[PDB]
Amino acid sequence: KLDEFLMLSEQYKSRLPKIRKLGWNRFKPIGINKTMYELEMLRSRARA
């Protein structure tokens, strides 16, 4: 039997980072042709 509380708890855990993860990938500002997903990629390579 599927626990309605437990399943809906996982749903909240899934949707919560989704708001923070909004800006990744597709979003592109004006004046910058590269998205912030690879801003942290090159930033990771910067120190390493």
Partner: protein, 326 residues
């Protein structure tokens, strides 16, 4: 103590009552330690899952080797009668009485949630011994109360502001129900309530300006009845989780099959379900089925029996058709 019954996946007014007691026990400022028997009667019904097949198995594991007290209904009248019995139980009962009077708002409710998670609850015992500078008792996650409080905290961060508004509306409804009771009159004045209430109300940061209109927001919302009350949706009188409801009915059917119970109270609340909880809680149908056999009703029993096997089979992913026919 009667009222409309509804299944809630949120903080029931009953859940905070345990939260009130655990706060007093851990704070150790008042030197009041709640007896272990009190906790085992309150938290244990909330513990998840017991399961019970209709027939083909009778009390295979449901029977407790040691006789247990009946689970407690979610009315402030019934909870106090547990604590009140002791000669010094008035001290324990008043501690819950003062706290429920101290919490006059939703922000105050949030104050209790924040206090427990930051300081009281502790991830593991390895950090327990390094927290010897704590003036309050600390609890491990794996403990009996620790696993309970973790679910309650998880059950608090899960909903939106709509969830917390329903929390405070029902508790005041839950609280004011006890006010119109003979037991409250015996505790109209107890001087110790003011002492314990003022212990937590301190550091309010304002006593001259905000409190005149702080009262106004509550009083206007509350039913002063001076004018027509602000119109709001009908609100349930009692909120119970699935697990707590499971423990009461399982105890009732076992007790019926062969510390005093309340048959009248349990039966009336179970009759006011909104027809969606019955789908989420199929065992309500069979509770009629056992009752139907008692008066030897043929047609009534069959509809309930068929009903119980329509809802149970779908929820359980395993095939249960081979069990329904026999």
């Amino acid at each position: 103590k009667y009222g409309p019954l509804g299944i809630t996946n949120f903080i029931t007014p009953y859940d905070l009552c345990i939260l009130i007691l655990i706060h007093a026990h851990c704070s150790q400022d008042n030197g009041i330690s709640v007896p272990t028997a009190v906790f085992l009667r309150l938290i244990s019904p909330t513990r998840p899952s017991l399961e019970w097949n209709p027939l083909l198995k009778d009390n295979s594991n449901l029977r407790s080797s040691s006789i247990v007290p009946p689970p407690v209904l979610p009315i402030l009248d019934n909870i106090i009668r547990i604590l009140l019995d002791d000669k010094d139980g008035n001290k324990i009962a008043l501690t819950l009485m003062g706290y429920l009077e101290a919490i006059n708002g939703l922000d105050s409710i949030n104050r209790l949630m924040m206090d427990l998670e930051k300081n009281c609850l502790v991830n593991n015992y390895r950090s327990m011994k390094m927290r010897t500078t704590s003036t309050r008792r600390q609890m491990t996650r794996a403990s009996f109360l620790g696993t309970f409080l973790s679910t309650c905290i998880r059950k608090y961060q899960i909903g939106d502001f709509e969830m917390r508004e329903t929390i405070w509306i029902n508790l005041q409804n839950f609280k004011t129900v006890f006010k119109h009771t003979p037991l409250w009159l015996r505790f109209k004045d107890n001087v110790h309530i003011q002492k314990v209430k003022n212990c937590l109300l301190a550091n309010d940061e304002i006593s001259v300006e905000d409190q005149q209109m702080v009262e106004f927001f509550q009083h206007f919302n509350n039913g002063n009845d001076a004018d027509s009350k602000t119109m709001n949706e009908e609100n349930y009188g009692t909120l119970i989780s699935i697990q707590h409801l499971q423990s009461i009915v399982n105890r009732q059917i076992v007790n019926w099959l062969d510390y005093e119970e309340q048959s009248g109270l349990v039966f009336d609340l179970l009759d006011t379900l909104s027809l969606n909880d019955a789908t989420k809680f199929p065992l309500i149908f069979i509770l009629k089925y056992l009752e139907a056999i008692k008066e030897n009703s043929y047609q009534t029993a069959l509809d309930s029996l068929h009903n119980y096997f329509d809802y149970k089979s779908t929820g359980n992913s395993q095939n249960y058709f081979h069990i329904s026919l026999l």
